[PDB]
Amino acid sequence: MHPGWPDTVGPLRVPAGVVGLRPVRMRDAAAWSRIRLADQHHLEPWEPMTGMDWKVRHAVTSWPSICSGLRAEARHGRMLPFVIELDGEFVGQLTIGNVTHGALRSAWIGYWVASSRTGGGIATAALAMGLDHCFTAVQLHRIEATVRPENTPSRAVLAHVGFREEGLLKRYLEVDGAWRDHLLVAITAEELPQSAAHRLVAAGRAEWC
Protein backbone atom coordinates (compact mmCIF):
# COMPACT_ATOMS: atom_id res chain seq x y z
CA MET A 1 0.00 0.00 0.00
CA HIS A 2 2.70 2.46 1.06
CA PRO A 3 6.13 0.82 1.38
CA GLY A 4 8.76 2.96 3.08
CA TRP A 5 6.20 5.24 4.76
CA PRO A 6 6.33 6.31 7.47
CA ASP A 7 10.06 6.18 8.13
CA THR A 8 13.11 8.28 8.93
CA VAL A 9 16.03 8.56 6.52
CA GLY A 10 19.71 9.25 7.11
CA PRO A 11 21.66 10.63 8.71
CA LEU A 12 24.58 12.03 6.69
CA ARG A 13 27.05 14.79 7.59
CA VAL A 14 27.60 17.68 5.19
CA PRO A 15 29.59 20.90 5.84
CA ALA A 16 26.42 22.56 7.13
CA GLY A 17 25.86 19.82 9.71
CA VAL A 18 23.92 16.57 10.18
CA VAL A 19 21.10 15.99 7.69
CA GLY A 20 18.19 13.58 8.01
CA LEU A 21 14.64 13.17 6.74
CA ARG A 22 11.50 12.48 8.76
CA PRO A 23 7.71 12.79 8.24
CA VAL A 24 5.88 16.10 8.32
CA ARG A 25 4.07 16.71 11.66
CA MET A 26 1.43 19.10 12.96
CA ARG A 27 4.03 20.73 15.23
CA ASP A 28 6.01 21.87 12.14
CA ALA A 29 3.56 24.78 11.68
CA ALA A 30 5.76 27.36 13.42
CA ALA A 31 9.03 26.60 11.64
CA TRP A 32 7.42 25.99 8.25
CA SER A 33 5.51 29.27 8.41
CA ARG A 34 8.45 31.30 9.74
CA ILE A 35 10.90 30.06 7.10
CA ARG A 36 8.49 30.08 4.14
CA LEU A 37 7.35 33.61 4.97
CA ALA A 38 10.91 34.91 5.31
CA ASP A 39 12.07 33.14 2.12
CA GLN A 40 9.34 34.25 -0.30
CA HIS A 41 11.79 35.80 -2.78
CA HIS A 42 13.99 32.64 -2.66
CA LEU A 43 11.05 30.25 -3.20
CA GLU A 44 8.25 31.88 -5.23
CA PRO A 45 10.13 32.04 -8.60
CA TRP A 46 10.74 28.26 -8.54
CA GLU A 47 7.65 26.76 -7.06
CA PRO A 48 4.31 26.14 -8.81
CA MET A 49 1.79 28.95 -8.52
CA THR A 50 -0.96 28.48 -5.93
CA GLY A 51 -3.17 31.40 -6.97
CA MET A 52 -2.94 32.58 -3.36
CA ASP A 53 -1.30 35.43 -1.54
CA TRP A 54 2.03 34.12 -0.26
CA LYS A 55 1.41 35.44 3.26
CA VAL A 56 -2.04 33.89 3.68
CA ARG A 57 -0.83 30.57 2.22
CA HIS A 58 2.00 30.37 4.77
CA ALA A 59 0.26 31.58 7.92
CA VAL A 60 0.82 29.26 10.88
CA THR A 61 -2.90 28.45 10.71
CA SER A 62 -2.64 27.07 7.17
CA TRP A 63 -0.34 24.19 8.12
CA PRO A 64 -2.88 21.78 9.74
CA SER A 65 -4.90 21.44 6.53
CA ILE A 66 -1.73 21.16 4.43
CA CYS A 67 -0.14 18.59 6.76
CA SER A 68 -3.36 16.52 6.90
CA GLY A 69 -3.48 16.53 3.11
CA LEU A 70 0.15 15.47 2.79
CA ARG A 71 -0.26 12.66 5.30
CA ALA A 72 -3.47 11.45 3.64
CA GLU A 73 -1.64 11.17 0.31
CA ALA A 74 1.15 9.33 2.11
CA ARG A 75 -1.26 6.84 3.69
CA HIS A 76 -2.53 6.19 0.14
CA GLY A 77 1.03 5.47 -1.04
CA ARG A 78 1.03 8.39 -3.47
CA MET A 79 3.51 10.68 -1.68
CA LEU A 80 6.34 10.64 0.86
CA PRO A 81 6.37 14.12 2.43
CA PHE A 82 9.61 14.52 4.40
CA VAL A 83 11.02 17.39 6.38
CA ILE A 84 14.75 18.01 5.97
CA GLU A 85 16.37 18.30 9.40
CA LEU A 86 19.71 20.02 9.93
CA ASP A 87 21.02 19.10 13.39
CA GLY A 88 17.49 17.98 14.29
CA GLU A 89 15.86 21.27 13.17
CA PHE A 90 13.41 21.93 10.32
CA VAL A 91 15.30 23.59 7.46
CA GLY A 92 13.40 22.48 4.38
CA GLN A 93 11.35 19.74 2.78
CA LEU A 94 11.94 16.76 0.50
CA THR A 95 8.82 15.41 -1.22
CA ILE A 96 8.46 12.27 -3.32
CA GLY A 97 5.27 12.61 -5.36
CA ASN A 98 3.06 10.88 -7.94
CA VAL A 99 4.25 7.50 -6.64
CA THR A 100 3.23 4.52 -8.80
CA HIS A 101 4.12 0.85 -8.57
CA GLY A 102 3.02 -1.96 -10.89
CA ALA A 103 4.76 -1.75 -14.28
CA LEU A 104 5.96 1.83 -13.69
CA ARG A 105 7.49 2.00 -10.18
CA SER A 106 8.35 5.67 -10.61
CA ALA A 107 7.82 9.01 -8.86
CA TRP A 108 8.99 12.61 -8.98
CA ILE A 109 11.15 14.21 -6.30
CA GLY A 110 11.34 17.82 -5.13
CA TYR A 111 12.97 19.81 -2.36
CA TRP A 112 13.73 23.21 -0.90
CA VAL A 113 16.22 24.49 1.70
CA ALA A 114 16.11 27.72 3.73
CA SER A 115 18.17 30.34 1.91
CA SER A 116 20.18 31.18 5.04
CA ARG A 117 21.40 27.56 5.02
CA THR A 118 22.20 27.13 1.30
CA GLY A 119 25.62 26.33 -0.13
CA GLY A 120 26.46 23.82 2.60
CA GLY A 121 25.45 20.58 0.92
CA ILE A 122 22.04 20.10 2.58
CA ALA A 123 19.85 19.67 -0.51
CA THR A 124 22.41 17.36 -2.13
CA ALA A 125 22.46 15.07 0.89
CA ALA A 126 18.66 15.19 1.27
CA LEU A 127 18.26 14.22 -2.39
CA ALA A 128 20.78 11.37 -2.17
CA MET A 129 19.29 9.83 0.94
CA GLY A 130 15.75 10.33 -0.40
CA LEU A 131 16.75 8.63 -3.66
CA ASP A 132 18.32 5.70 -1.78
CA HIS A 133 15.11 5.37 0.24
CA CYS A 134 13.04 5.31 -2.95
CA PHE A 135 15.18 2.56 -4.52
CA THR A 136 15.18 0.39 -1.40
CA ALA A 137 12.26 0.83 1.01
CA VAL A 138 9.75 2.33 -1.47
CA GLN A 139 10.69 -0.41 -4.01
CA LEU A 140 10.78 2.09 -6.88
CA HIS A 141 12.65 1.65 -10.15
CA ARG A 142 12.85 5.25 -11.35
CA ILE A 143 12.89 8.79 -9.93
CA GLU A 144 12.39 11.92 -12.05
CA ALA A 145 12.44 15.65 -11.38
CA THR A 146 11.28 18.72 -13.28
CA VAL A 147 13.49 21.82 -13.11
CA ARG A 148 13.53 25.12 -14.97
CA PRO A 149 16.69 25.55 -17.10
CA GLU A 150 17.24 28.86 -15.29
CA ASN A 151 17.40 27.11 -11.88
CA THR A 152 21.17 26.69 -11.81
CA PRO A 153 21.45 25.77 -8.09
CA SER A 154 18.89 22.98 -8.40
CA ARG A 155 20.40 21.61 -11.61
CA ALA A 156 23.70 21.42 -9.72
CA VAL A 157 22.04 19.43 -6.91
CA LEU A 158 20.55 17.01 -9.42
CA ALA A 159 23.91 16.70 -11.23
CA HIS A 160 25.66 15.90 -7.91
CA VAL A 161 23.49 12.78 -7.46
CA GLY A 162 23.76 11.64 -11.07
CA PHE A 163 20.42 12.55 -12.68
CA ARG A 164 20.32 12.47 -16.51
CA GLU A 165 18.50 14.96 -18.68
CA GLU A 166 15.72 13.19 -20.61
CA GLY A 167 13.78 16.02 -22.25
CA LEU A 168 12.42 19.55 -22.22
CA LEU A 169 8.78 20.02 -21.24
CA LYS A 170 7.54 23.09 -23.07
CA ARG A 171 5.34 25.48 -21.05
CA TYR A 172 5.00 22.74 -18.46
CA LEU A 173 4.11 24.46 -15.19
CA GLU A 174 2.69 27.81 -14.14
CA VAL A 175 5.59 29.34 -12.20
CA ASP A 176 6.30 32.99 -11.37
CA GLY A 177 3.42 34.28 -13.48
CA ALA A 178 3.66 32.25 -16.70
CA TRP A 179 3.87 28.76 -18.20
CA ARG A 180 7.56 27.83 -17.96
CA ASP A 181 9.66 25.22 -19.74
CA HIS A 182 11.01 22.60 -17.35
CA LEU A 183 13.77 20.12 -17.97
CA LEU A 184 12.88 16.53 -17.14
CA VAL A 185 15.74 14.67 -15.47
CA ALA A 186 15.71 11.09 -14.22
CA ILE A 187 17.66 8.20 -12.73
CA THR A 188 16.92 4.48 -12.33
CA ALA A 189 17.96 2.04 -9.63
CA GLU A 190 20.26 0.08 -11.95
CA GLU A 191 22.43 3.19 -12.55
CA LEU A 192 23.77 3.22 -8.98
CA PRO A 193 26.60 0.68 -8.49
CA GLN A 194 26.72 2.16 -4.98
CA SER A 195 24.11 4.10 -3.04
CA ALA A 196 23.72 7.80 -3.75
CA ALA A 197 24.99 8.47 -0.22
CA HIS A 198 28.10 6.39 -0.96
CA ARG A 199 28.61 8.40 -4.17
CA LEU A 200 28.43 11.67 -2.18
CA VAL A 201 30.96 10.45 0.39
CA ALA A 202 33.28 9.28 -2.39
CA ALA A 203 33.06 12.70 -4.07
CA GLY A 204 33.83 14.53 -0.82
CA ARG A 205 30.37 16.12 -0.53
CA ALA A 206 29.27 14.22 2.61
CA GLU A 207 30.61 12.05 5.44
CA TRP A 208 29.14 9.02 7.16
CA CYS A 209 27.55 10.16 10.39
Structural domain containing residue 140? 1-209
Instruction: Write the CA distances from 98 to 21, 95, 140, 194, 209, integer angstroms.
Output: 19, 10, 12, 25, 31
Nearby residues of 86 by Cβ (< 8 Å), 6 or more positions away:
16, 17, 18, 19, 117, 122
Instruction: Specify the experimental method.
Output: X-ray
Q: Resolution, in Å, please?
A: 1.7
Give binding residues as ranges.
111, 113, 119, 121, 123-124, 151, 205
| DSSP label of 62 | G
Which residues define the annotated binding site for acetyl-CoA?
111, 113, 119, 121, 123-124, 151, 205
Total domains present in the chain? 1
Cβ atoms of 116 and 131 within 8 Å: the answer is no
